[PDB]
Amino acid sequence: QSCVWYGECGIAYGDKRYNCEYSGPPKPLPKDGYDLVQELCPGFFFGQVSLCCDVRQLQTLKDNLQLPLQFLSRCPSCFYNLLNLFCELTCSPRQSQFLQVTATEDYVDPVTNQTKTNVKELQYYVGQSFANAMYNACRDVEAPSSNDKALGLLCGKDADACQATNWIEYMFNKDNGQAPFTITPVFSDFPVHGMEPMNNATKGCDESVDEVTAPCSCQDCSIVC
Ligand SMILES: *[C@@H]1O[C@H](CO)[C@@H](O[C@@H]2O[C@H](CO)[C@@H](O)[C@H](O)[C@H]2NC(C)=O)[C@H](O)[C@H]1NC(C)=O
Numbered sequence: 001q002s003c004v005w006y007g008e009c010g011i012a013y014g015d016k017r018y019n020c021e022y023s024g025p026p027k028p029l030p031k032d033g034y035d036l037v038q039e040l041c042p043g044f045f046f047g048q049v050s051l052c053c054d055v056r057q058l059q060t061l062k063d064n065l066q067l068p069l070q071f072l073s074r075c076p077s078c079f080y081n082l083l084n085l086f087c088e089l090t091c092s093p094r095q096s097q098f099l100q101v102t103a104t105e106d107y108v109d110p111v112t113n114q115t116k117t118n119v120k121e122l123q124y125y126v127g128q129s130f131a132n133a134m135y136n137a138c139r140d141v142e143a144p145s146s147n148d149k150a151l152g153l154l155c156g157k158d159a160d161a162c163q164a165t166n167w168i169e170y171m172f173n174k175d176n177g178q179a180p181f182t183i184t185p186v187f188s189d190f191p192v193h194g195m196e197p198m199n200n201a202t203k204g205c206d207e208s209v210d211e212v213t214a215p216c217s218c219q220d221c222s223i224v225c
Pocket residue numbers: 041042043044045046084087088200201
């Protein structure tokens with residue numbers, strides 16, 4: 001197994017950071033990050049919890065999930081697949097299979113003056129079926145106390161123009177003011193020049209995420225009506 005990054009490096013803009021380039025194997029997560037990994041990416045919470053992310057990156061992921069939560073929190077299945085898209089990107093011990101760094105710049109530690117490398121942009125090979133299922137679970141979600149669709153607030157365009165791939169492309173575009181750096185998505189259910197797209201299992205909005213989480217309401221999910 002191999003990573004493309006590990007830990008945070010320099011400022012991108014605002015309070016947002018690039019991650020440090022790293023191409024070695026995943027590393028066991030410190031125990032102080034177990035609460036975060038349980039909360040965000042419980043699918044990875046087993047064995048040595050060897051991941052291609054550190055505690056800082058998990059904390060940053062949690063902070064950055066606030067706006068998706070703002071609009072999608074009422075439909076746990078919809079939010080679940082979205083969290084998984086980000087968990088795999090952030091932490092997967094097999095990152096190198098589906099991520100390709102495309103731009104870097106040097107990072108200089110201000111105290112030791114040791115150089116590291118900011119991952120400035122990367123390409124993310126996302127399963128076509130994954131992306132379609134993620135959109136499918138979210139597409140009827142209503143913005144809280146409204147009759148408009150939640151995706152119209154997370155897609156940089158109205159809901160009637162929002163589609164699976166342009167949604168993911170928008171969320172991954174730092175021009176949105178939220179993403180710290182741009183990720184360019186490539187959608188395929190098939191390998192691409194030896195890259196194996198991320199095609200994790202997904203949950204529909206009519207399914208329970210787990211034993212303690214109900215399916216989404218009829219208002220947010222026309223299947224359950
Ligand atoms: C994406 O899917 C992979 C493959 O199913 C998940 O990895 C498994 O997770 C379960 C639950 O902890 C473990 O029992 C297995 O040992 C894992 N399998 C392998 C082959 O790694 C992974 O959890 C999913 N990703 C996320 C973020 O949930």
